[PDB]
Amino acid sequence: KSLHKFRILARSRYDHTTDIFKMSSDKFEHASQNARYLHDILQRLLAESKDLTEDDFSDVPLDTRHTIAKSLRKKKRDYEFPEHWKRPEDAPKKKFDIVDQLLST
Amino acid sequence: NENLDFYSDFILRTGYYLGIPLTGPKPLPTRRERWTVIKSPFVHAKSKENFERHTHKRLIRAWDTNPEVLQMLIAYITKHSMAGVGMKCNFFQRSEISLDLGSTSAVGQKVLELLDSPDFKKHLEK
Amino acid sequence: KRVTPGSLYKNWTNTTHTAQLQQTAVPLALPIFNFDDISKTLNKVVSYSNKQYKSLHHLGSFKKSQFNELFQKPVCLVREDATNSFLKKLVSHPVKKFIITGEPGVGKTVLLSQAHAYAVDSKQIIINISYPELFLNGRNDFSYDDDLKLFIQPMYLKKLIRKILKANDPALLKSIELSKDYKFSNANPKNASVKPFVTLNKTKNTVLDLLSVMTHPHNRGKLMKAIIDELSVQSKVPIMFTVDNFSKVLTTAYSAYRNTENKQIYSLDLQMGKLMMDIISGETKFANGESSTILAISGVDRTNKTLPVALGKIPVDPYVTRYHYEPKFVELLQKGNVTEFEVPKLNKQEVNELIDYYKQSNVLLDKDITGKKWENLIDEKYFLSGNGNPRELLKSLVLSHR
Amino acid sequence: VVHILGKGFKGKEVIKIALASKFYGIGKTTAEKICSKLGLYPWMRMHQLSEPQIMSIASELSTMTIEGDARAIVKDNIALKRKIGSYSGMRHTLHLPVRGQHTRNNAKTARKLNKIDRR
Amino acid sequence: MNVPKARLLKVAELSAKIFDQNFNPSGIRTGSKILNERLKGPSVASYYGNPDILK
Amino acid sequence: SNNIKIKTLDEFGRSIAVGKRKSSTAKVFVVRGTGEILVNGRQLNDYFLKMKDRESIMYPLQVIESVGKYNIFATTSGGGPTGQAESIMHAIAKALVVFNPLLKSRLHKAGVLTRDYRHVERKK
Amino acid sequence: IQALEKSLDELAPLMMTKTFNTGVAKASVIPVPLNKRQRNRIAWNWIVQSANQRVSSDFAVRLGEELTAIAKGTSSAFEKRDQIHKTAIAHRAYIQLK
Amino acid sequence: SRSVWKGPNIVPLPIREAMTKGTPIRTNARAATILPQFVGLKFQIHNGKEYVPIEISEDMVGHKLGEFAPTRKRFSYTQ
RNA sequence: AAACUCCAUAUAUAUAAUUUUAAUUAUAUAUAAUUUUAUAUUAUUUAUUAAUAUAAAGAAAGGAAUUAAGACAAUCAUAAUGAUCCUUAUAAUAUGGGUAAUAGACGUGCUAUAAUAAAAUGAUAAUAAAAUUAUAUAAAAUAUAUUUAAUUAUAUUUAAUUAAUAAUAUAAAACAUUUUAAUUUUUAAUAUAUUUUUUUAUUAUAUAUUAAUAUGAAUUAUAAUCUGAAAUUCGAUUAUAUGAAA
Ligand SMILES: Nc1ncnc2c1ncn2[C@@H]1O[C@H](COP(=O)(O)OP(=O)(O)OP(=O)(O)O)[C@@H](O)[C@H]1O
Ligand SMILES: [K+]
Ligand SMILES: [K+]
Ligand SMILES: [K+]
Ligand SMILES: [K+]
Ligand SMILES: [K+]
Ligand SMILES: [K+]
Ligand SMILES: [K+]
Ligand SMILES: [K+]
Ligand SMILES: [Mg+2]
Ligand SMILES: [Mg+2]
Ligand SMILES: [Mg+2]
Ligand SMILES: [Mg+2]
Ligand SMILES: [Mg+2]
Ligand SMILES: [Mg+2]
Ligand SMILES: [Mg+2]
Ligand SMILES: [Mg+2]
Ligand SMILES: [Mg+2]
Ligand SMILES: [Mg+2]
Ligand SMILES: [Mg+2]
């Protein structure tokens, strides 16, 4: 239940296909400052997700519309060679070479 | 490309002795910038000279190395860098979810000052 | 005038459909379609019977863009994987609610015409909605009925009722005696000014009399509700309700009609839409257990998530906009337990049979008969048709002059 | 021929298109609302209309600002520009473009229609 | 789409709070864009080069 | 020494060849079969709407009269329908030579083994 | 297709007289032979012009009707061919033959 | 056309003196928007060369001062 | 000059732990052709030959840049040097205006004048390439125009990416269906059909008309929006209305 609430509250920052939650910040002038800022937000998001005393957002289904828009901008080569077309009996068969067989002994 | 490839080869040699597994240099797509300069005739004769600039790119990846050793690599190759080569380094640090001690804009300040000045307070009076 | 009595003035698609170009076709003697003796006609090209042709022309089973004008009368290949498989499920399945799917031009309409041919032979009353777009495009009159609380379409209903009367055997219709008394306003131009109303008493008049009632346009919606109710209460004759191009209904939730507030009218607020979905959903139950409901999609219509979700092929996505997902239609289809029958593509042996019939019909070009080996032709036409598509096969043979 | 408020229409003409074609001030969107309000189906033609329905169209058309009334509003807005002495008013008086168009070339239509008593 | 708007608004508000984002449900023009645009002065003022060159 | 190694069928009996036309590319898998073709996982009539494009793909198999003797799994990217269809045509011809190297001369004579060099030329 | 090729072979003129601006004096009208690709162009343009006089809105229908009439013997473009061949027979002596 | 939500194009002008004394307001702010207060006051509006005298009416509110001080002379040809 | 050289194309090797994925790719190096050979025919300077065709091998088919002189043109608002003239002005700054004026004429474009062609619709989303994003590119969502929704425009909010990663951006035509004035070639009411998305019959379905329509989108009214400190002279966009010439 808390995992579902976490994914709902992340909104566009969660990709269901890959299960990755990614957030970036360059608001501050130093990387250390920006790293803490992201860390603090992560703790806040986790605390809210693990506090299911008032609302768990279980009725609300996960929204993937942002991920769908991203997928339409990348070409998907999701087709593989049919397995029932494979003809393993037509593959070349290793020939017997006495020289290589004799050079190994 | 010539200095880029030579320097890339040197980085692989530096990493090996440091104990850093390295992959590459992977060639990335070359960027081409173009500019056309119309010449004095502009009569549709040989009246447009063309120019271009190619950015050659190489990616070297480091694996399974401690941060201290990785910094030694960057320091050494920086000390002995070649002319006309630029370098960007993305470091990836795996961390724990909860850490210890962690890892106001100029315009907003001036707005508050302006809204307190008499030229603005004289109107906000209710 | 520029147009003479016999001049071909329409566009190509309408000219081929309407110009009676089959008159010059050569008469061939083919076996007749009979499901009771399918063993003798399986995997063979057959013509329909004289009783079947008359009914199917009145039902709209044959459509334009089917190269029907190449042959004296429309013909069909009795297939084992499509025709025999579907008709056996229709006779055995207890629910008897099907939706025919498949890629564009695979032969979904022809399969429905073969199901109509079976029904004619098996003494059933067929109610066909060939082109549902005619009651959703806003090109005929509409009126609101207060007693039905639905928007009735008199012009369309007049045509539909005549099709149900002219396409079905009068004897079957006469057998169904009426269960209730009905009174309508008289529009018969002979006694309309003498008899204000026409009464149909129960147990005396039949559903044949009900289908011949001439009423005013405003009372024609109440005549369509009586006809359907009478056919759904009787248990003597099975009723086969069919709808071709049903994809148009699923993807056009809102008709072109607008109410008095300039708001487009929901399709289920039309009597035709409500009636169609009541039979599909199961709200209108037929007493006879051999009654069926065969729907067919068409590739000329847009596709969306409505039908795939209703058939269980994809999960429900709640955030899909209503223009690409109509949850009310999904509920109705799943309430009726509608099952999918995907029309398979033709195999190479079926292509051989069709091309052998085409050779005997003299429809093949001279480049495919002279100097070409028969086996080469079959292999080439099976490859150029997408490995079975009947429509791409015909086009490669008669509409590819390159 | 069907006559609505003097305008004559050929029988085959579609009502929603004909209304937006012969009546000043009524366009496509306005014509559709009139037909929807009167219960005329989207592609009904003029010859189908009955006399009660022809009177209903005239009634709804007479409760709108069309024909002279609409044309007077444009003529009075143009006159106001000239009365106040605005730059635009002078352009209307001089039969010149009033929307910033160049006049070194073209400007033929402005020289033909721009006037204080605009049609 | 079937998710009640009230439920989707509660998620938006809570999400905005966690991520320090401005929640403006009404849509009133607030000028927040002006407060977030980057300062281009330093780049613009260096167009002609560094003035502190040896002469 | 030379830089050419005899081409042979792979572990599954498939001949793999690549073809290019304009900006399009095609990688086809030819195996002995019954004339089944798939383009990017889709039926031929679905992917290629023009019958002339379909006839271009079939031409190499028609030259060796082996239209019903092979199954083709074609994958294509770039350019448009014509470039992809003819890139597949070129790739099938190059993949058919492994099954019978004696037919290369007939394929060359038909013109299906020649890479079409024409591409969009920036006006000069 | 066989009907189309037969109609094109019967309607197209075998030769056509062309004016050559040879010499400062008047140009010479000399009969010239036509190849098969040039013959088909002349006959096709005649067919298209005849087709576009028919009533159908669809060019395919008008073209189909025109081609059917030509395959059945009736065409007004056979007069054009006879007039191109008459001119050439008149100027037979103007040919050069070297 | 300035967006209505932004408000009028208000410029610094000496309106108090023109309302207590009746003096004309000489200005080059041709972009200025004629506010409803200006009604009745006398303005001298630059046109690039001279200052055109104009008194504001109620039908001029919303327009801009520049609209009433033409900057070009009517065209004429040496026919 | 040519050769050479580079680019393109074909091939080989190397690189990528094939999630920066396009391995059907990226970019370094190398190889290849200024193709080669047999045969018949026709010419020849007839021989160890060209033009031809025939057969065989081959992926092989296209481009780029390139010398020095001679005679002549341009102010270069695209760099100079001198002379010459201004030096409270011919130098410098600010506010506003102009460069956008309009009789005629000319060049170059855009959109049109309809049916081998225009308009709608097409969501498990037909099919590209080359570019751009720290003086940014802006996703999805929500709100309004505005209607169930979509579409289009803007606002609200500012996800990701400073990039083979994320965004601009689901390319478009194509193809399919529907519609389309002139056109009584239509539509409607009845009857009719073994053309049913349709046929036939009988009635009505206007005249006007060499002509401008449901073609065309100039001009113009009103309201709103975008950029900017500012859109009056003098910007862009949207909605309703207007609908010229052709
Ligand atoms: N069994 C068959 N025997 C003969 N011809 C057939 C058969 N099946 C299909 N055809 C032919 O294939 C073509 C397409 O058939 P049909 O119209 O039934 O396809 P469909 O899938 O319903 O098409 P759409 O997707 O356009 O609705 C027609 O020319 C039809 O005559
Ligand atoms: K109008
Ligand atoms: K101007
Ligand atoms: K001009
Ligand atoms: K890959
Ligand atoms: K200016
Ligand atoms: K057009
Ligand atoms: K694209
Ligand atoms: K302006
Ligand atoms: Mg961010
Ligand atoms: Mg989008
Ligand atoms: Mg991308
Ligand atoms: Mg069908
Ligand atoms: Mg200028
Ligand atoms: Mg796509
Ligand atoms: Mg968006
Ligand atoms: Mg698309
Ligand atoms: Mg389109
Ligand atoms: Mg005119
Ligand atoms: Mg228009």
Residue numbers in the entry:
A (entry chain Y): 214 to 318
B (entry chain J): 52 to 154, 180 to 202
C (entry chain W): 49 to 450
D (entry chain M): 2 to 120
E (entry chain X): 1 to 55
F (entry chain I): 140 to 263
G (entry chain G): 150 to 247
H (entry chain S): 9 to 87
Sentences from the paper on this structure:
The mitoribosome is essential for the intra-organellar translation of the 13 mtDNA encoded OXPHOS subunits in humans, directly supporting the formation of Complexes I, III, IV and V. Indeed, without intra-organellar translation, mitochondrial respiration cannot occur. Using comparative sequence analysis, mutagenesis, biochemistry and cryoelectron microscopy we show that METTL17 binds to the mitoribosomal small subunit during late assembly and harbors a previously unrecognized [Fe4S4]2+ cluster required for its stability. We then grouped particles from the two datasets and resolved the structures of the SSU, SSU-METTL17, and SSU-mtIF3 at an overall resolution of 2.3 Å, 2.6 Å, and 2.8 Å, respectively.
In the SSU-METTL17 complex, the 72-kDa factor is found in the cleft between the head and the body and its presence prevents a monosome formation. The NTD is a Rossmann-fold methyltransferase domain, characterized by a seven-stranded beta-sheet core sandwiched by six alpha-helices, while the CTD is a unique fold that consists of a four-stranded beta-sheet with an alpha-helix. The comparison with the non-bound state shows that the association of METTL17 withdraws the rRNA helix h31 causing rearrangement of h32 and h34, and the entire head is rotated by approximately 3 Å up to open the tRNA binding cleft. Thus, h31 is more exposed, and the rRNA nucleotide A1100 in h34 is flipped out. We identified an ordered density, adjacent to sulfhydryl groups of four cysteine residues Cys373, Cys379, Cys400, Cys513 (yeast numbering, equivalent to human Cys333, Cys339, Cys347, Cys404). The unique feature of the embedded [Fe4S4]2+ cluster in our structure is that it brings together residues that are 140 amino acids apart, thus stabilizing the N- and C-terminal domains of METTL17 when it’s bound to the SSU.
